[PDB]
Each structure stands twice: as structure tokens, then as C-alpha cells.
Design an enzyme around this catalytic site. Sequence first.
Site, mmCIF file in Angstrom:
data_model
loop_
_atom_site.group_PDB
_atom_site.id
_atom_site.type_symbol
_atom_site.label_atom_id
_atom_site.label_comp_id
_atom_site.label_asym_id
_atom_site.label_seq_id
_atom_site.Cartn_x
_atom_site.Cartn_y
_atom_site.Cartn_z
ATOM 1 N N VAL A 124 -22.600 42.481 -4.806
ATOM 2 C CA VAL A 124 -22.208 41.142 -4.382
ATOM 3 C C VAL A 124 -20.762 41.195 -3.895
ATOM 4 C CG1 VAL A 124 -21.980 38.773 -5.075
ATOM 5 C CG2 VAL A 124 -23.815 40.153 -6.127
ATOM 6 N N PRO A 125 -20.454 40.791 -2.649
ATOM 7 C CA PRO A 125 -19.046 40.741 -2.225
ATOM 8 C C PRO A 125 -18.344 39.557 -2.871
ATOM 9 C CG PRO A 125 -20.539 40.096 -0.415
ATOM 10 C CD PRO A 125 -21.301 40.031 -1.699
ATOM 11 N N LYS B 252 -24.809 39.706 -9.742
ATOM 12 C CA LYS B 252 -23.898 40.831 -9.938
ATOM 13 C C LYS B 252 -24.091 41.487 -11.304
ATOM 14 C CE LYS B 252 -19.110 42.034 -8.949
ATOM 15 N NZ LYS B 252 -19.182 42.117 -7.457
ATOM 16 N N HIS C 17 -29.512 22.371 5.464
ATOM 17 C CA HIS C 17 -30.860 22.797 5.107
ATOM 18 C C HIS C 17 -31.436 21.904 4.014
ATOM 19 C CE1 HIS C 17 -30.214 27.192 6.690
ATOM 20 N NE2 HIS C 17 -30.395 26.315 7.659
ATOM 21 N N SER D 208 -33.662 13.609 19.287
ATOM 22 C CA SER D 208 -33.387 14.993 19.667
ATOM 23 C C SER D 208 -34.395 15.922 19.016
ATOM 24 C CB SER D 208 -31.974 15.446 19.255
ATOM 25 O OG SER D 208 -30.971 14.631 19.796
ATOM 26 N N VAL E 37 -35.042 -9.897 -19.601
ATOM 27 C CA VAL E 37 -36.372 -9.714 -20.164
ATOM 28 C C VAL E 37 -36.208 -9.403 -21.645
ATOM 29 C CG1 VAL E 37 -38.526 -8.363 -20.081
ATOM 30 C CG2 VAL E 37 -37.268 -8.917 -17.993
ATOM 31 N N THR F 224 -29.670 28.531 21.171
ATOM 32 C CA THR F 224 -28.757 27.552 21.744
ATOM 33 C C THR F 224 -27.961 28.108 22.918
ATOM 34 O OG1 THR F 224 -28.492 26.246 19.731
ATOM 35 C CG2 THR F 224 -26.686 26.183 21.340
ATOM 36 N N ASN G 117 -29.063 32.569 18.516
ATOM 37 C CA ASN G 117 -30.322 33.109 19.022
ATOM 38 C C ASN G 117 -30.768 32.412 20.311
ATOM 39 O OD1 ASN G 117 -31.439 34.849 16.501
ATOM 40 N ND2 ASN G 117 -30.694 32.880 15.671
HETATM 41 O O1 LIG Z 1 -26.907 27.672 17.845
HETATM 42 C C1 LIG Z 1 -26.938 28.248 16.731
HETATM 43 O O2 LIG Z 1 -26.085 29.097 16.376
HETATM 44 C C2 LIG Z 1 -28.025 27.981 15.705
HETATM 45 C C3 LIG Z 1 -29.453 28.182 16.243
HETATM 46 O O3 LIG Z 1 -29.762 27.115 17.116
HETATM 47 C C4 LIG Z 1 -29.426 29.478 17.054
HETATM 48 O O4 LIG Z 1 -29.658 29.304 18.283
HETATM 49 O O5 LIG Z 1 -29.205 30.590 16.521
HETATM 50 C C5 LIG Z 1 -30.570 28.320 15.179
HETATM 51 O O6 LIG Z 1 -30.601 27.145 14.379
HETATM 52 C C6 LIG Z 1 -31.919 28.437 15.888
HETATM 53 O O7 LIG Z 1 -32.724 27.546 15.556
HETATM 54 O O8 LIG Z 1 -32.177 29.333 16.739
HETATM 55 NA NA NA Z 2 -33.378 15.761 15.980
#
Ligand SMILES: O=C(O)C[C@@](O)(C(=O)O)[C@@H](O)C(=O)O
Ligand code: NA
Length: 742
Positions: A715-716, A709, A689, A248, A110, A336, A334
Site C-alpha cells: 500500500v503506498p 497493509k 460514484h 445529458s 399522540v 471524452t 478514454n
Molecule cells: O473524461 C474522463 O476522463 C472520464 C471518462 O469520460 C473517460 O473518457 O475516461 C470516463 O468516465 C469514461 O466514461 O470513459
Molecule cells: Na446526465
Amino acid sequence: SAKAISEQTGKELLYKFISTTSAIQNRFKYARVTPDTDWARLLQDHPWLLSQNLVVKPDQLIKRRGKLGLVGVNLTLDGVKSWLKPRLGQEATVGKATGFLKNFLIEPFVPHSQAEEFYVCIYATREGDYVLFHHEAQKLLVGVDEKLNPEDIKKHLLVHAPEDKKEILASFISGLFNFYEDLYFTYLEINPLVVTKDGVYVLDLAAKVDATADYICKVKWGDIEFPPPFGREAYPEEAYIADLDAKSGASLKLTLLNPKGRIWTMVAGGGASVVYSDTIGDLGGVNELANYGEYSGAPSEQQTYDYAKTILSLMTREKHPDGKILIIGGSIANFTNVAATFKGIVRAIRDYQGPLKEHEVTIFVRRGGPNYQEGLRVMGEVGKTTGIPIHVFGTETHMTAIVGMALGHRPIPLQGKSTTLFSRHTKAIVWGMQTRAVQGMLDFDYVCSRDEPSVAAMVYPFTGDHKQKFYWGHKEILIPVFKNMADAMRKHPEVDVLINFASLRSAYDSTMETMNYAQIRTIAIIAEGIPEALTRKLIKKADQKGVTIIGPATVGGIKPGCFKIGNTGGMLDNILASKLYRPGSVAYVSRSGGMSNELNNIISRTTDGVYEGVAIGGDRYPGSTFMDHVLRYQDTPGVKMIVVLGEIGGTEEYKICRGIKEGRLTKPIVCWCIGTCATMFSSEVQFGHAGACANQASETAVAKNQALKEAGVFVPRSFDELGEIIQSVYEDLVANGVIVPA
Ligand SMILES: O=C(O)C[C@@](O)(C(=O)O)[C@@H](O)C(=O)O
Ligand code: NA
């Protein structure tokens, strides 16, 4: 997360969907060239290649190709073939990155003058999308859910532009912005846009789209490709995992860094996986680190089997003189199920046992969570029956300790919304079919010696009204379930919290609907995968109404003695283990849900225990930020020290620094920012994330840990000394009388 697309993909979307009213030129006049190109078919499909001079350049997410001299300009077709001949197939160096030049773009040349070159860019922020214009920059913010006023374009962006080009420039900019919103772009830069008498030419295009919007943009995106950054390759196993992730509710991610590395990880959680990678990087292992990835959100046995067998196949392609190690890690989960997932992994190991012995693989396990004792037993079992060395460790071993075990030697061959969100009086509605999570809250409520269950009602629009049985201690009780949110609200004015377990597809509307009920002051949004443009609209309404949003993409949070969100903190044995049934003096905030249960564990071992924890979630625009929660904790008398677990990306943590300097924050704050390994890679690495993308030097974990810090935050040196520094600070406050334990 937002992902880059190639110039060709961006131009293909632009040529298909931008409004025809802008006078776009050379529509669809591009030709892709790779080593396997059939030049005969190419000339048939693009006959304009033989009739005009051409420009050729690589299209592999290389920036500033021009000033690097990777652009052949104003060539005939044979000039392009000669230009390609010493370049196609050959490796080049760009920054820290080296890769093969395998993908080129031919377009028409161009002719134009300097004065016909313009710059346009559109990019997303929390507060809306900015539009940049520059002849040769003017800047305009289009607010969340606002329109681009074509007289703001002419009056603000085009103030210095030649008057005879203003109308075509404004039309193009209007069309470009509608194109950007409709196809869920987050970054779009055209540099230069060429405007001549004959219309508009798009000479260079760089762009990113919000990949979580696929369920919205399927039709228009088509079979859209997300190239790797320059210097990495795409791998079929990555697409397989991507395919499993699409099928999933759980999250399943895999990026290959060095297929020949001898360090492989299979870590649960987006946060923990970054922390293990950090630890690996601090021990000099980064050059041998083969992958980044994670699983979370409670994948099934079969999904985990399918994930795991992908890793084991990848790590048994060729031998390493020193054998290989597999780090099977995570936080204390928590939610899983450790038995079911570890049974999946165990099945994969059995099915690969021959190749794993042959490649001299040692396996290191550290996990907690629901059913984690069965999980660790079957893990040690398969090590005994196969003869593969497997070293198994539970919750009393520090999260990252298996890394040094494995790498230390080669195995021997403006006004805030509200200060207090939850109390012993909190009553909640739960949106969704979530009997197990609700039972897990009532269990917590009972051992917390609450007078009343924390869940007053549930809403689920896909069934009719009914009562649902739960246990309250050992007594059977009933909790109403409503088809209609209106019914649940008018019958439970006492309720001030809603926990929304809607799927990502239904989360936006169900949350916007909740916010028509002023009685609800706090909403937890669990679902991962909400498009960022939709979250921005949730953030706008919540700010207009004064409603605190926790989430999206989180497990929630916990307030010992009082209330916990859904699956936070898990089963009874972890609640007891970490003493989450009564308060101590330490408040915390993390992005990551899994890591907050690790903080629960760390804080309970080293202090009077947790007073409040919140996980703000992994998304790019969280409903409530670190600072919001740290302010609450500053204004809450029973909090005496604050623990923040930060993360690469964005500049939130610098608000803590400013709060300290301004005299607003005064309690002791401990902070560690994860992601310090990201700087050691030769190409950028997109972590789990959505937020974890570093756009400038100041957004790195290392820079943030340094600024924090200097401002007086404690801060570690690294995450695995966080527990140490939390202990010492607590001990000073005990020694100074500020904390008086029981
Ligand atoms: O399995 C894990 O360690 C991560 C997670 O799945 C949990 O169970 O702590 C977390 O991402 C959630 O969403 O609860
Ligand atoms: Na998924």
C-alpha cells in the site's frame, strides 16, 4: 445514488401511496415552519393546530433529535410558538456539524405507553431488502424479485409481539414493504411506530430513495427535494448543474463545500476528482476547498461551457487576500473529447476574464485524452490573450502534481464463473449505434496484429438490417447490423461477448434479453444511471446463468494483444503511448474508467506493461466485484502482480485480506483506496460514484488501506506514490526471476 429525503417528504409519500388497508392515523396532519412562514395562512391550511396538543421538531436530516433536546412535546400552539422563538433562526451543533435550524415540523401529539412503541426498518443490499422489527431485532431477508410472505412476517418478525396487535402489525409491514419497492426506496426507518387501539401512528421517519429511478417514479415523487446534510446549505447553482445533468448522457455534478474557499476544482472523472480532493486534503487544503464535483462521459462543448461558467461565477463573488486557484484536472481520458470540452472551458474563461483578473485567479491544467494536444494548446492560448496565469501540463506530468505546485506557495501577485474472459479469438456483438467506438476497437485489433476484427456484428432495434462500413487497416470492410438480436445470434455462433451501449432507459431489457442466449458468456454494460433495484435483478439472472457482467456505469476494460471493450484506452496514440498493443505482466482492477487509463499509463511506464485491466464501474452493486477479478488474475499464469485501485465505501477490499490469510491469493497485490479526504469534512460528502458512501467506520478508505497493509498488501502512502510502489515490486520480481522482460 441514494439520497436522503426529509421526514415531511417521506410522510407525504407514505400518506399518499401506502395501501389504505393499514389503519394509518393523523394522515396529512403536519405543518412545515420556516422563518418566512405566514402563521395566519398556516392556521387556515392546518386548522387541527388549534384543537389539540402538538409536537414540534426540526426536519433537516438531524438524527436522534429527541436525546439532543430538539423536540418540544405535548405543547399547545402558543407553547409551540414560544418553543420556536429562541430556536428558529439560531445555529446548533450536531457532531462535527453546525448549521441554522431553519425548517421545523409540527404534528399532533399522540399519547401512548412504552408498550405501544415499535421499530421497523427496511434497507437494501445486493442480495435483497432486509426488514427489521423490534418491540421497544428480528430480521427477515426479502430476496431479489421475491415477495414478502405475510406468514413469514407473523412467524419470524412478530414472534415476541402481543397477539392482539399481530394482524395490524403484519398488515402495516406488508403495506410498508410494497410502498418501499414501488417508490424505489433504499432505506426506510420508522422509530417509533406507535400502535394503539385507534390505529397506527408514524412518529419518526428517516429514508433514502434511489434518485436514478426518477424516470420511473416521476408521477408519484412529484417535485421531490433532496436536502443537504445538516451543516451544509443548498445552492441554486447546484440545481442548475443538476438540471444540466438531467439533460445529458454525460455526467455533471457539483457540491459546494465552502463558497468562500480559495481552492476550486474542475476535474474530469468521478475517480480522478476524488483523487485530486485527496491530494488537496493531504496538503492541508481541505478547509479552503470550495467544491467537489466532476464531469465525465463526453459532455459536449456547450455543456462544458455551461458547467465551467457556473464555477467561474461562483469563484468571483468575493476577493481573497491571497488570490484563488482553479485546478482543471483529470486522468488520460478514454472517450471524452479533450479539444471540445477544453474549448468549452476556454470560452467560459474568456467570457469571465475581467472578473478572474480582478479576483487574482491562477489556473493549473493537467489533462490527457482524445485530442488532448489541441485542448492544451487552446488552454495556453487563452492564457496568453487574457493575461490570466494558466500553467498547462500533459500526460508526462503525474496526475496530481499540479496540486502541490498550486498549494506549495501562494502565487506571486462457491464456484467462480470463468477465469479467462477474452483472448485474440474473442468475437463480440455491439448493441447500439456506436460506429466510432467500433472503429476504435478495430484500430486496436489491427495494431495488435489480430487475424480478424473483434466485432462480428451489431444490433440496433431502431433501424432495419444493413451493412456498415469500417476500416480494417486501410481496407474497407463491412459489418452486419441487425434489427433483431435473434438474427445476430443465430448467424454468429462464434460470438461470446456482447458490449451493450443501450441508454440507461433501455439497458435493463436489452441486457436481460442477451442473457437468453447461452452463447454469450460476458456482457459489458456501459450505461450509467441504471436504478440499483434493476441492477440487482440483472445480477440475479447473470448469476443463475453463469454470465460475467462487467458494469454498469463503466467504459469496460482492456486486454493488450487480445481485446478491448468499446472506448477503453481511447485512440491509437494512447494505445501506442501506453504500449497497450502487446501484453506485459501486470493485471489491475478499478471501479473508475478514467483512472484505469491512468493506470494504463502508470503501469506502462513502470513495468513490462498491462496484462489485463477491468473497470468494474461506479455503481452500488457492480456486476462483477474486485474479488471476482482478483481471483481470475490469481489463476492466470501470465499475471505476475495485481494492482487494485479501491475506493471508500463497502467492504469488498476486506475479501482480498481474507483471500490472503486463507492462502487463496498469493501473487503480489498493490492496493490504494481513494477517498481519504472524506473523513476531513464536517459533513458527509457524496462523491461521483454511487458506491462511494461509507456506512460504517470500516468502509473508509483510511481504514481499508490500514487493514490491507496489515494483511501484506503493498500500500503506498497516497495515490501519488502508487506508481513508485508498483515499480519497486515489479523490480523485485525481475530481480527474483519471476518476470523475464523482453
Ligand atoms: O473524461 C474522463 O476522463 C472520464 C471518462 O469520460 C473517460 O473518457 O475516461 C470516463 O468516465 C469514461 O466514461 O470513459
Ligand atoms: Na446526465
